[PDB]
Symmetry: D2
Subunit: 319 residues, 4 copies
């Protein structure tokens, strides 16, 4: 049987020792997985996803690269809370240097809730990890019988069991009662094709996210920059447009060396280059086909190796 | 024919006798078909991009729509507006217009100069919706891409697509295909005449800030809004309105200091429920439920023109 | 406590005597509902939804009107299979003469499946039935924490727990862990405002559904008409367009007195009047904002009281 | 500049030196911008509405796209096609074109004469996608409403909207905004060069009927298709491909008689799985999995040009 390691980041999502007790619990909740793979488990952290920090990210990614280097460790499944699951998977996607499957799975309902999604999500995540076709697909998310590329996925609804979507593309595969089928695959660089390496990095650059609205202000740009932000993701109106006042504030901070990346509050689509705001002239970067919270993870990583407007924009037009 | 007034908030959404406003005059030439259906009056309320929208433009606009709609000769009011913030303007007027006559906001995802410009058709369909019988008492509506959306539900969800507008929580209330208007549903949430908000004597809207949550969040943005004098704050939290621990304490501090903290979600749809993870009652917050951060901000500025009481404000979010 | 009757149409969807044993089972699976309402239960039928017939429909609707006439019967919940659930609810919506809530609920996963949606769907359906706001909303469907108007709902996916959508509008309300919220309501005539009455009707008119495709045929029109169809729903290409050959066949059958209603295979949108095909001249009716399977239920009902092209078209432009 | 050939299957999707086809000539005048990007050749393969499409037009088209793509001077091939059946044509060529050079199908939801006609912009974006580097080896694609859709996944899902096209099971593979092409994904399912289907020596496609299931279903439509000589039948069943009992027995009879019965679903998305309610193996049916009834029909006519074997045909549905 394939050996797989489940890394728990908090509590149980679903209902001898795999290693972590949290993982032994899940294995009791779903005795089913044991006929599928040899499961070992570790407790990477003990938090809720809304408490996650860059430190936990580094910890995880580094631990994931270790596990994946071992010839007898076929894949790694990370049980994660849903709130920030898309940020962690995206990070890992640009930071894990392996062709082996890394599957993040979670649950919209407590395991103690009637009709808890967790058990089937776990059963399905495990079948995807050990599936020959998941190799080279990059980091993926398994929720509600669907398989999403980590670049494309976002949590679009607050409570629905089907809260995960890939607004710009769509899921890449499906897994129904453990049967896995892939129809597409990402074409943008991930994992072994990523230029970022976080072994040696211990702290990530500060990057704040600003939310645009009419009658906007300049004090939040100011406070982020005075608090030491290296980058600022501006979730702008429509096609990444800012209120004239905050634009002035964003132009001053870019001259002060803070990298200002224009995103959008909108929810989907690309925040294009050469639309209404002139980024070359003002010194901003356009985040293109990425939301504010994922554009931030990219900006943090970009900042660990550069701060040139042209080079960062190239990264956004690349990943 | 019915008399319709068109209030221009910026420039021509279609194309590149004087109705009253030059912009309106270029629209009428842009697509003449509109003249065979209504006697149009045009009026320039402001000349800006929707990203430059401000509370004062909002106040002037509403006050004007109310003067126009009191007139028997005026059947409807169409507002050409930029897309970026159309949803906030529409939502504001919806809790602020005291008439059941239709108030229609229309725009274009592409420049009038563009090839396959969407503005002409949206304008034409918009005149049809304004003069249709079934549009009365439906509240303020947005007409874009052959669809009719309720003001409370509409949001621009894509940066560039001609079909950028959606109502994620519900769906469009009707359709308009080459002038043919049909309604299939209607908002059961109070609006217009049934709204308790009256902007008549208001010169200024209170300041309400919106903060975007993420892992490794901070408390400096909360404090700045506080110092900058925010009367209220919308927190687009993680998942079901969840704050990062550090930023929750900062928020708790602002609520003690009298700033109204309303929890929303950066997620995009769904409700930021009560009785979820955060104890709002104990922390002194208010859950905005089925509203995105930006419309939750418009409801809060309004609420604040009347009350700062947490219970009342919660009730307002649970009603509108 | 409100009294409510659950009418079972087949087996258990979820996990003293309410009446039907199927209903006693559900009550054991979800002891929760018993603090909510006084439940009585009946077994209207013992079939899978793909076996449903017009006879079962009449039976149900007639039984529903009876129950709803009783002052102490607050609402009726019908546990139904998902395949044809939209056809039954639509029928009932135009046939139940009451202002009381009629809620259809089902399950995409077996109750014996891990993460079965049935228990929470039942818990939620019961909270909606007894909710003061569900009165006058017409017949509704409760699936996956959502409330759909019966006119608008369709099963859009074969396996997803979230397979129910209202493609043209959207759900009208939500029910999360029993908390119910309505945001919209239908504006098209239902229940007490419907002109149809099925007490006295014992058999419904035959109406076949044809599927359009390039290189289409005329033998299926022919066989439906020779088999005695009174109406034929043509699920056409795009905006209800037919292949020239089958159009000829459809024009001959309309002259032979079969009512031909143009719908679409497309999935959403209105199959408009005065688009590419001239219905007046050819004698067809345009089904407008309705799919093939729901346009068929309407045509059957229209046929119980008329067969004039103008009057039927008015019904399609009405309901 | 790159040389692109435009094959017109009907009329002008935009607008109301000779490229080679008059229609193509009107397109070039409709939007000149296209001439600054490629040297265009035009060609009228047929002049019909897409609802009149037939198997023979499909065969001629493919055979021609293959002659064109063998030529070194030909960089891509754009096919203007009516929307109604664009998805079947695209899917056919996708399992039938032996070249990795891009094959792009474009159309318009509105008449070229219409106000805010979508055809001009779609045409322009379509030329950009055909001449872009990343389009090679992506398979046949449809370009509509600023989006690039894989042929296997595309379907017209709304009767009138300019954004009628979607890929319900996956999503668009990329986007094209004012000529700027980006790809975010690609089909992992075999197409074009990797397809085992070769139409070169084929004069006719076998007859495959599609039946629509519903409660109180019948057996007379199954028998008629049988009598009419159907070689295969697509059954758009209820939910997960479920037939009404009566019609299942009729279908079982056709499978015994050598007609290939392939179970699909009228539902609209999802897969018509195996190991579901019907025992296909025992009944002799084939499950079409993640394919709608109409594309499942195109795959089956193809399969049938090679085999009638149930196992093989199932494998083909499980692969493409």
């Amino acid at each position: 049987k394939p050996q797989v390691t489940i890394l728990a980041t908090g509590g149980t999502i679903a209902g001898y020792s795999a290693g972590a007790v949290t993982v032994d619990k899940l294995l009791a909740a779903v005795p089913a997985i044991n006929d599928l793979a040899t499961i070992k488990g570790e407790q990477i952290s003990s938090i809720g996803s809304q408490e996650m920090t860059g430190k936990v990210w580094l910890k995880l990614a580094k631990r994931v690269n270790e596990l994946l280097a071992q010839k007898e460790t076929e894949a790694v499944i990370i049980t994660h809370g849903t709130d920030t699951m898309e940020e962690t998977a995206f990070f890992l996607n640009l930071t894990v240097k392996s062709q082996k499957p890394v599957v993040l799975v979670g649950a919209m309902r407590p395991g103690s809730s009637m009709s808890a999604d967790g058990p089937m999500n776990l059963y399905n995540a495990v079948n995807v990890a050990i599936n020959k076709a998941s190799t080279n697909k990059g980091v993926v998310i398994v929720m509600n019988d669907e398989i999403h590329a980590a670049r494309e996925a976002t949590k679009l609804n607050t409570t629905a069991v089907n809260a995960f979507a890939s607004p710009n593309t769509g899921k890449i595969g499906t897994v129904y009662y453990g049967k896995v089928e892939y129809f597409t695959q990402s074409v943008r660089p991930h994992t072994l094709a990523s230029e970022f390496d976080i072994s040696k990095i211990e702290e990530l650059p500060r990057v704040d996210i600003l939310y645009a609205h009419p009658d906007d202000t300049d004090v939040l740009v100011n406070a982020a920059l005075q608090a030491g932000a290296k980058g600022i993701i501006h979730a702008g109106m429509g096609n990444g447009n800012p209120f004239p006042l905050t634009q002035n504030a964003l132009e001053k901070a870019a001259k002060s060396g803070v990298v200002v990346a224009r995103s959008s509050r909108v929810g989907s689509g690309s925040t294009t280059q050469e639309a209404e705001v002139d980024d070359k002239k003002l010194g901003f970067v356009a985040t293109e086909s990425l939301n504010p919270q994922k554009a931030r993870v990219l900006l943090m990583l970009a900042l660990t190796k550069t701060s040139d407007r042209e080079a960062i924009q190239k990264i956004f037009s690349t990943y």
